Amino acid sequence: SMNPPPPETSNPNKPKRQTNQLQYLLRVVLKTLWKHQFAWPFQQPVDAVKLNLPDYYKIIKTPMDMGTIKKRLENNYYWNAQECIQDFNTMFTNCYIYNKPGDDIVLMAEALEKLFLQKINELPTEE
Ligand SMILES: O=C(CCl)Nc1ccc(/N=N/c2ccc(S(=O)(=O)O)cc2)cc1S(=O)(=O)O
Ligand SMILES: O=C(CCl)Nc1ccc(/N=N/c2ccc(S(=O)(=O)O)cc2)cc1S(=O)(=O)O
Ligand SMILES: O=C(CCl)Nc1ccc(/N=N/c2ccc(S(=O)(=O)O)cc2)cc1S(=O)(=O)O
Ligand SMILES: O=C(CCl)Nc1ccc(/N=N/c2ccc(S(=O)(=O)O)cc2)cc1S(=O)(=O)O
Ligand SMILES: O=C(CCl)Nc1ccc(/N=N/c2ccc(S(=O)(=O)O)cc2)cc1S(=O)(=O)O
Numbered sequence: 001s002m003n004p005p006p007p008e009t010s011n012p013n014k015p016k017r018q019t020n021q022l023q024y025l026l027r028v029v030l031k032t033l034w035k036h037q038f039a040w041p042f043q044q045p046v047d048a049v050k051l052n053l054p055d056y057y058k059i060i061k062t063p064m065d066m067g068t069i070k071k072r073l074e075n076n077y078y079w080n081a082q083e084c085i086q087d088f089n090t091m092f093t094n095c096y097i098y099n100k101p102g103d104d105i106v107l108m109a110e111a112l113e114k115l116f117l118q119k120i121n122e123l124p125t126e127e
Contacts, residue, residue, distance in 0.1 A: 001048060001049045001054050002049065003045070003046075003047060003048055003049055003057070004057055004063070006045045006068060007045070007063065007064060007065075007068045008077075009068060009071035009072050009075055009077060010075055010077065011077065014077070014079075015079050016076050016077055016078060016079055017076070017078075017079055017080075018076050019080065019081065019126055019127070020124055020126060020127045021080070021081040021123055021124060021126050022073060022076070022078055022080075022081055022084065024081075024123065024124055025073055025081060025084050025085075026070075026073040026074065028116075028119045029066065029069065029070050029073060030070070032115060032119060033066065033112060033115060033116065033119075034066070034070070036111070036112070036115070038107075038108040038111040038112055039066065039108075039112060041105060041108060042065055042066045042067075042091060042095075042108075042109070042112060043065070043066055043067050044065055044067040045063060045065050045067065045068065046060075046063060046065070056098065059097065059098055060094045060097070060098055062090055062094070063094060064087050064088075064090040064091040064094065065091055066088075066091065068087070069084065069087050069088065069091070072084070072087070080126075081123065081126070085120060088113075088116055091109075092109055092112075092113050095109040096109065
């Protein structure tokens with residue numbers, strides 16, 4: 001079995017800029033989300049080889065993870081906060097599509113998402 005290449009975290013072809021909202025999202029990742037135990041399955045791309053889930057990248061064609069998101073934020077990859085929020089929602093949706101409701105991984109994703117939603121409710125107005 002083989003993993004796909006991980007999502008890009010730099011792209012000289014893709015427009016980008018620094019904004020106060022994206023700095024907010026970076027510190028949300030670094031200072032609020034990452035530190036919880038429930039984050040550990042989401043801190044890196046799914047290793048379908050190690051997990052013995054050969055179906056994973058058959059089912060999930062838009063993989064995303066918080067390790068990728070953190071790097072994108074650190075690297076100023078995004079043009080706006082909507083792009084970053086979309087990446088979080090892709091990560092959560094993948095988990096909910098792939099796993100049975102009630103599975104521990106779904107509960108972990110829901111804990112992470114609850115915290116995430118609390119923070120994006122307080123997203124600062126863009127400067
Ligand atoms: O230096 C430039 C343009 Cl000035 N080239 C470039 C620019 C962007 C690029 N993007 N590559 C990827 C690779 C993977 C994904 S992903 O798996 O969908 O996340 C996205 C973009 C690849 C390349 S390149 O193939 O390495 O030339
Ligand atoms: O990217 C920018 C650059 Cl100005 N802005 C942005 C980007 C995303 C955004 N999304 N906010 C939310 C708020 C709540 C949910 S909800 O709880 O899942 O309904 C989703 C997105 C709000 C905004 S904003 O309201 O325009 O600041
Ligand atoms: O097509 C699906 C998802 Cl793959 N239907 C589904 C939907 C929900 C489900 N069971 N969910 C739960 C969730 C929580 C508990 S609990 O921890 O005992 O409260 C039990 C079942 C099982 C299934 S099912 O096992 O696949 O029929
Ligand atoms: O995000 C999701 C799944 Cl994608 N929420 C969800 C949605 C429905 C759900 N259903 N749980 C149950 C629990 C018990 C029964 S019963 O004992 O068979 O009546 C059915 C569904 C469990 C959950 S979950 O346990 O929080 O995953
Ligand atoms: O570290 C990587 C490689 Cl870039 N990926 C990864 C990604 C997720 C993961 N664990 N995922 C799950 C899935 C389901 C459950 S369960 O529902 O509680 O059984 C737990 C962890 C394990 C791993 S792994 O152990 O490191 O292979």
